[PDB]
């Protein structure tokens, strides 16, 4: 990789600088380079990795949705056909999005997940594996869609099992995992009843654990709880 000659600490420093500069493509390249140094990531460094790639793939997902909508309307009844250009460009963005997912999934599989020696690190990485298979699922169609969906499910489910055994119900990684698995169920797997049930149980069990938290931890937990509540309002 082009980051092979840079020190680990310098890559982390520059990832933080790129975040300040809103240069998320740079930030992701720096964090990829830091991961490839082969050392385990701290909590802060894991978050830097996630922020970088989530911003990169988020821009791609937003573009793909814009383009896919245009494409669907140029294929409606009575809507003239302006040639191949919309499909071509949607495919270009799709392929770039798929390459980003492939890159992240590759970092997780070589070798973040296997070396993760804590519940908190292993759940974080397994949640990320589920997330990036979900992003692949959003654009998948033929004959591989079902297997991509089940790869996302398998990852989320293992993370869920560990988080329930090893973390308290208010743990922000546990909460964000459950949130994202509920979104998987609702938006990807056509399982709205599972999504609702998970979000309700997640919210109620966290509510009953808030009393154990400091103000600092209480703030982190309740932010994600409000997202669970917001989704339940949409879904019910």
């Amino acid at each position: 990789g082009a980051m092979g000659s840079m020190e680990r600490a310098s890559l982390i420093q520059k990832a933080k600088l790129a975040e300040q500069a809103e240069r998320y493509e740079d930030m992701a390249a720096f964090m990829k380079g830091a991961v490839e140094k082969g050392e385990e990531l701290s909590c802060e460094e894991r978050n830097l990795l996630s922020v970088a790639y989530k911003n990169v793939v988020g821009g791609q997902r937003a573009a793909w949705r814009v383009l896919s909508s245009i494409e669907q309307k140029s294929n409606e009844e009575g809507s003239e056909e302006k040639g191949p250009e919309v499909r071509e460009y949607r495919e270009k963005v799709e392929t770039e999005l798929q390459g980003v997912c492939d890159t992240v999934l590759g970092l997780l599989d070589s070798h973040l997940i296997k070396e993760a020696g804590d519940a908190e690190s292993r759940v974080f990485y397994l949640k990320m594996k589920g997330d990036y298979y979900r992003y692949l699922a959003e654009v998948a169609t033929g004959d591989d869609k079902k297997r991509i969906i089940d790869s996302a499910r398998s990852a989320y489910q293992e993370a869920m099992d560990i988080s329930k055994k090893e973390m308290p119900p208010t743990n922000p990684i546990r909460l964000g995992l459950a949130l994202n698995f509920s979104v998987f169920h609702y938006e990807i797997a056509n399982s709205p009843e599972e999504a609702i049930s998970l979000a309700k149980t997640t919210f109620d069990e966290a509510m009953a654990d808030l009393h154990t938290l400091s103000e600092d931890s209480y703030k982190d937990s309740t932010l994600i709880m409000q997202l669970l509540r917001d989704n339940l309002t949409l879904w019910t």
């Binding site: 996630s50 922000p172 990684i173 909460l175 964000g176 938006e187 994600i224 997202l227 949409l234």
Partner: peptide
């Protein structure tokens, strides 16, 4: 759309 988690998690 449904809301998913923010990128950074404590």
């Amino acid at each position: 759309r449904s809301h998913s988690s923010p990128a950074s998690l404590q």
